[PDB]
């Protein structure tokens, strides 16, 4: 809340598998730049 | 590495533990030669000292001076006042629902669900009320999680105001902080949350400051005389004469006439003129700040006699009946009220078992009657008749072998 | 129950707001209305039993409020799109 | 009754006779919940971790762990183990 | 509670012996992928 | 917090991207010394 950004100890490796498990990958290519996104999807076999 | 303190740590623990520990070592250097022994004594007792801090100011002044725990309490108060935070701070601690005059149980220790009915009843009980908090308490700087002890279903989220005492202390294993409470709080919003499969009630709280001298009477005069020295000359000769004749023996007759439904069916025009003039003069200089005053009352003011079985507060059934009868109900007086801003016990009301704690809102009409040197009375502030009071919380203390009640109230406009 | 005073996941947004729709203004979540669309406000929906709907290290409230690093693309401010390099 | 011994936030009778998680709260299992896709769990009422894996009984059932752990490792009797 | 994952100091070697001691191993081979599991088994010689 | 100055743990790499993403670069050359500055710029697509 006071504008204090810390990057030491935070790692993307902890979240890669979790994000890949519960999301779909959408890629837009255009002609000069490519984009990649992950969008959350619902699991119909889980009532909760 | 350099952890900046924000207003709230939210759920960060490491960022809170490191800051608290660093502040602990910083404060350790500045402490005096007996502050460490006072801290150690609190560390080994930690329970009785809190109760003493809450209930000490209700004994005799010579009893207060002769109390064995007075020195330790004073030293810990000084240590707390040593460190004042420059900015407000959000705090977390667990408070039992019984503190807010809620006798029913929201849920037991091992229960999980919180029913809607209990939530609604608690919300009805807490709204539009003021609650006073006192004593030394351990405070958590971060919201507890799965590695913390959660004894009560109710979690309090409070924002400490400017210039509040703070004292991070190490209990030889971990780091903790200690504060002294001399303020009133209000609950704004309550929301139901889930922590590790158990429901909880999260209450947002704010601090309403009040002027309370407790047993310090010299400071009481220091403010009262400065406030109401200029009130003397503002009074017209007729109003001044009526005010004088009040405590020159006419106050008792006026109060007896006013209690007995006089001004309605059996009035006296002179008494009505006198009371109108004195209440007009009282409104001249209303109190410009929230103030706390004390007043010792007997069973007659609460519809009981000195021989009433319920008046014997040594049996828990009597306390339960008194609380169920009086808590959450309005109290009204048709006459004038004189209260003592000092909480010290005196021989005038030695045997009375009921103590009133009147809270005066800012701007409310009043007059410091103790500003005249011709009246030997000490520490008196007067209020207008036809008043209304709201009973918030009732507590009981031991005065030797006599169990007496403390009643907190609020004077609405 | 029958009131907007519930926070099951404890992420500063009420359950019904996450269930139906909400937007952040003055750092406070409010009920979505159609008139907000013309002023440039978006409509957000998210999981009311999960603190991080997308699984990224930022909660739903942080993403919706945009109170994280300001070098993240603006499309990663809604809870259903993950911030991920 | 509502007696809890191992402090896993699940009552002893629920663990012994069957339970399920809805809205992150353990509730008594009823036979009609199977139609809606729920499962029936039984676990050790004297152990916080029935299977020995780091996650407790409540976490495994509620799903309050890594969302990349296979869904079959959610009942307390199957250990999350790579 | 705030949905943050830490993977430092959480070794899998502290639980391998304990899990293997009180479990039974079941393996399914199928045709193109193999699955291996452990299921906790009761000890009838311990009344507790 | 005691009036001292600490330069350990305070890294510019945490704020470089955040500063660059919301600022406009202005450079003054002159003859002797060159100056480079970044100035915050308002976003008109976000009402907040
Ligand atoms: Ca929520
Ligand atoms: Ca959510
Ligand atoms: Ca249990
Ligand atoms: Ca268990």
Could you tell me the CA-to-CA distances from C67 to B20, E4, E45 in Å, in that order?
25, 17, 58
Q: Which of B211, B230, B261 is where one domain is finished? A: B211
d(CA B130, CA D54): 46
Q: Return all residues near C58 (Cβ < 8 A) that are at least 6 apart.
A: C52, C68, C83
Measured between beta carbons, the chain A residues lying within 8 angstroms of E7 are 11, 13-14
| CA nearest to D75 within chain E | E39
Instruction: Answer whether residue B11 is part of any domain.
Output: no
> Exposed, middle or buried, B250 (CB in 10 Å: 0-12/13-18/19+)?
middle
**DSSP state for residue B170 in the 8-state scheme:** E
Cα B107 to ligand 4 centre (Å): 21
How far apart CA B85 and CA B76 sit, in angstroms, is 17
Q: Residues B359, B413: one domain?
A: yes
Residue of B nearest to E2 (CA): B11
Residue B28's φ and ψ, nearest 5 degrees, are -55, -35
Coil, strand or helix: which one is B121? Answer: helix
Distance in angstroms (rounded) separating the CA atoms of residues E43 and E22: 9
- Tell me, in angstroms, the distance from the centre of ligand 1 to residue B370's CA: 56
Question: Are the beta carbons of D81 and E19 separated by less than 8 Å?
Answer: yes
CA D44 to centroid of ligand 3, rounded, Å: 8
Chain C residues lying within 8 Å of A19, measured CB to CB: 54-56, 82, 84
| Chain centroid offset of residue B174 CA | 31
**Is the same domain home to B363 and B259?**
yes
Torsion angle of C-alpha atoms C36, C38, C40, C41, degrees rounded to 10: 20
Both structure tokens of B127:
């709204």
**Measured between alpha carbons, how far is B89 from B20 in angstroms, rounded to an integer?**
13
d(CA B110, ligand 4 centre) in Å: 14
B103 and B229 housed in the same domain: no
Other CB atoms within a 10 A radius of the CB of residue C44 amount to: 22
Specify whether the CB–CB gap between B39 and B169 falls below 8 A.
Answer: yes
For residue B174, the SS3 value is: coil
Residues B183 and B325 reside in one and the same domain: no
- Tell which residue, C3, C20, D24, has the closest CA to residue B116: C3
For B151, list phi and psi in degrees, rounded to 5. -80, -30
Distances (CA, A) of D13 to B197, B334, C54, E40: 16, 59, 36, 20
Q: Are residues B265 and B400 in the same domain?
A: yes
Do B197 and D62 make contact, defined as CB atoms within 8 angstroms? yes
Of B108, B110, B197, the CB nearest to D25: B197
* Tokens at B223, concatenated: 């403010």
CB within 8 A of B187, min separation 6: which ones? Answer: B100, B126, B127, B129, B203, B204, B205
**Does chain E reach chain F with at least 3 CB pairs under 8 Å?**
no
Let me know the angle formed at the C-alpha of B6 by B170 and F43, rounded to the nearest 5 degrees: 160
Q: How far is D62 from chain C (nearest CA, A)?
A: 11
CB B155 within 8 A of CB B198: no
Q: CB under 8 Å to B7, separation ≥6 — which residues?
A: A1, B87, B88, B89, B90, B159
Beta-carbon pairs below 8 A across chains C and F = 22
Centre of ligand 3 to C-alpha D25, Å, is 13
CA–CA gap between residue F13 and residue F15 (Å, rounded): 6
Same structural domain for residues B118 and B229?
no
Q: Which chains touch A (3 or more CB pairs under 8 A)?
A: B, C, D, E, F
Q: Please give the residue of chain C at the shortest CA–CA distance from A10.
A: C57
Number of residues assigned to chain E = 48
Residue B45 located in a structural domain: yes
Distance between F19 CA and the closest CA of chain C, angstroms: 8
Residues B335 and B306 grouped into a single domain? yes
Q: What residues have CB less than 8 Å from A30, skipping those under 6 apart? A: none
Regarding whether B297 and B189 lie in a shared domain, the answer is: no
Assigned domain for B28 exists:
yes
**Phi, psi dihedrals of residue B395, rounded to the nearest 5°:** -130, 155
Whether the CB-CB separation of B323 and B100 falls below 8 Å is answered with: no
Cα angle D73, D74, D76 (rounded to 5 degrees) comes to: 95
B139 in the same domain as B49:
yes
Could you tell me if residue B348 is inside a domain?
yes
Start-end of H helices in chain E: 16-21
Asked if residue B224 is part of any domain, the answer here is yes
Distance, CA of B143 to chain centre? 26
Q: Which domain holds residue B184?
A: 19-211
CA D68, CA A16: separation in Å to the nearest integer?
A: 10
Find, in chain C, the residue whose alpha carbon is nearest to that of D62: C49
CB D3 within 8 A of CB B110: yes
* Exposure string over D36-57, b if 16+ CB within 10 A, otherwise e: eebeebbbbbebbbbbbbebbb
Instruction: For residue C53, give the 3-state DSSP assignment.
Output: coil
In the annotated binding site of B for Zn(2+), the residues are: 113, 199, 385
DSSP conformation letters of B244-285? HHIIIIIHHHHHHHHHTTHHHHS--HHHHHHHHHHHHHHTTS
What Rg do the C-alpha atoms of chain E give, in angstroms? 16
Q: Within a domain: residue B7?
A: no
List of E strands, C26-76 = 28-31
Please report the DSSP string for D32-67 in residue order. Answer: GGGGGT---B---TT-SSSSSSSS-HHHHHHT-S-T
Residue B126 in tokens: 């807490």
Two tokens at C83? 């911030």
Chains touching D, CB cut-off 8 Å, 3+ pairs: A, B, C, E
Number of structural domains found in chain B: 2
Q: What are phi and psi of B236, to 5 degrees?
A: -70, 155
Q: Confirm whether B248 is domain-assigned.
A: yes
Of the three residues B187, B211, B235, the one that is the final residue of a domain is: B211
Kindly state whether residues B186 and B130 are assigned to the same domain: yes
Same domain, B327 and B338: yes
Dist. CA B42 → ligand 1 center (Å) = 41
User: Are B340 and B193 in a shared domain?
Assistant: no
Q: String of b and e for C10-37 (b: at least 16 CB within 10 Å)?
A: bbbbbbebbeebbbbeeeebeebeeebe
Distance CA E10, CA D81 (A): 14
Among E15, E39, E43, which would you mutate to test the D interface (most chain D Cβ atoms within 10 Å of its Cβ)? E15
Nearest to A19 among C49, C69, C84 (CB): C84
Instruction: Tokens for D10, please give them.
Output: 């699940």
- Spell out which residues have Cβ within 5 A of ligand 4, the ion: D 6, 8, 43, 57
D4 touching B (Cβ < 8 Å): yes
- CA of residue E6 to ligand 2 center, whole Å: 21
**Inter-residue contact B217 to B379 (CB < 8 Å):** yes
Specify if B10 maps to a domain.
no
The pairing of strands B198-208 and B175-195 is antiparallel
Question: What does C8-29 look like in DSSP terms, one character per residue?
Answer: SS-SSS-HHHHHH-EEEETTEE
D19, D60 Cβ separation under 8 angstroms: no
Cα–Cα distance measured from residue C47 to residue C61, given in angstroms and rounded to the nearest whole number: 11
Chosen domain end from B191, B211, B231: B211
Q: Scanning every residue of chain C, which has its alpha carbon at the shortest distance from the alpha carbon of F14?
A: C69
Distance from CA of B195 to the nearest CA of E (A): 8
C-alpha B193/C-alpha C6 separation (Å) is 7
Using an 8 Å CB-CB cutoff, list chain D residues near B113. 25
User: Considering only CA atoms, which of B293, B294, B311 is closest in space to residue B302?
Assistant: B311
């Amino acid at each position: 809340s006071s504008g204090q950004i810390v990057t030491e100890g935070n790692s993307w490796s902890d979240y890669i598998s979790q994000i890949d498990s519960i999301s779909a990958s959408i890629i837009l290519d255009t002609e000069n730049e490519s984009y990649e996104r992950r969008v959350t999807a619902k699991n119909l076999q889980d009532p909760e | 590495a350099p952890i900046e303190r924000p207003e709230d740590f939210l759920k960060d623990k490491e960022k809170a533990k490191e800051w608290e520990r660093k502040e602990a070592e910083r404060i350790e250097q500045k402490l005096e030669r007996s502050e460490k022994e006072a801290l150690e004594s609190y560390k080994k007792d930690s329970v009785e000292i809190s109760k003493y801090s809450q209930t000490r100011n209700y004994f005799y002044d010579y009893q207060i001076e002769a109390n064995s725990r007075e020195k330790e309490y004073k030293e810990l108060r000084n240590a707390i006042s040593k460190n004042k935070i420059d900015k407000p701070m959000y705090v977390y601690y667990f408070e039992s629902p019984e503190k807010f005059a809620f006798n029913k149980v929201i849920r037991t220790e091992n229960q999980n669900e919180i029913s809607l009915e209990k939530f609604n009843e608690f919300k009805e009980t807490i709204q539009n009320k003021l609650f006073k908090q006192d004593g030394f308490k351990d405070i958590s700087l971060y919201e507890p999680g799965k590695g913390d002890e959660k004894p009560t279903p109710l979690l309090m989220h409070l924002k400490l105001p400017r210039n509040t005492g703070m004292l991070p202390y190490t209990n030889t294993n971990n780091v903790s902080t200690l504060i002294e409470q001399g303020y009133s709080i209000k609950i704004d919003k309550i929301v139901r949350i889930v922590i590790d499969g158990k429901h909880y009630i999260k209450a947002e709280a704010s601090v309403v400051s009040s002027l309370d001298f407790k047993d310090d009477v010299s400071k009481g005069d220091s403010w009262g005389k400065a406030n109401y020295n200029d009130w003397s000359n503002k009074l017209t000769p007729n109003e001044l004469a009526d005010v004088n004749d009040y405590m020159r023996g006419g106050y008792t007759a006026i109060n007896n006439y006013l209690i007995s439904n006089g001004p309605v069916n059996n009035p006296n025009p002179e008494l009505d003129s006198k009371i109108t003039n004195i209440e007009n003069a009282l409104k001249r200089e209303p109190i410009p700040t929230n103030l706390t005053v004390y007043r010792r009352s007997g069973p007659q003011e609460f519809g009981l006699t000195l021989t009433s079985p319920e008046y014997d507060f040594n049996k828990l059934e009597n306390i339960d009946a008194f609380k169920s009868k009086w808590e959450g109900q309005a109290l009204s007086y048709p006459n004038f009220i004189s209260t003592s801003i000092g909480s010290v016990n005196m021989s005038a009301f030695a045997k009375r078992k009921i103590v009133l704690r009147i809270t005066i809102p800012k701007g409310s009409p009043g007059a410091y009657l103790s500003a005249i040197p011709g009246y030997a009375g000490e520490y008196e502030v007067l209020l207008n008749h036809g008043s209304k009071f709201k009973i918030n919380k009732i507590d009981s203390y031991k005065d030797g072998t006599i169990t007496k009640l403390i009643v907190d109230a609020t004077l609405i406009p | 129950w029958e009131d907007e005073d519930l926070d099951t996941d404890n992420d500063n947004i009420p359950d019904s707001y996450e269930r139906n729709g909400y937007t952040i203004k003055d750092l406070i979540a409010v009920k979505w209305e159609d008139s907000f669309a013309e002023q440039g406000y978006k409509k957000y929906v998210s999981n009311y039993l999960e603190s991080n709907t997308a699984g990224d290290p930022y909660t739903d409230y942080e993403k919706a409020s945009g109170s994280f690093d300001k070098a993240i693309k603006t499309e990663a401010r809604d809870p259903l799109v993950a911030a991920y390099p």
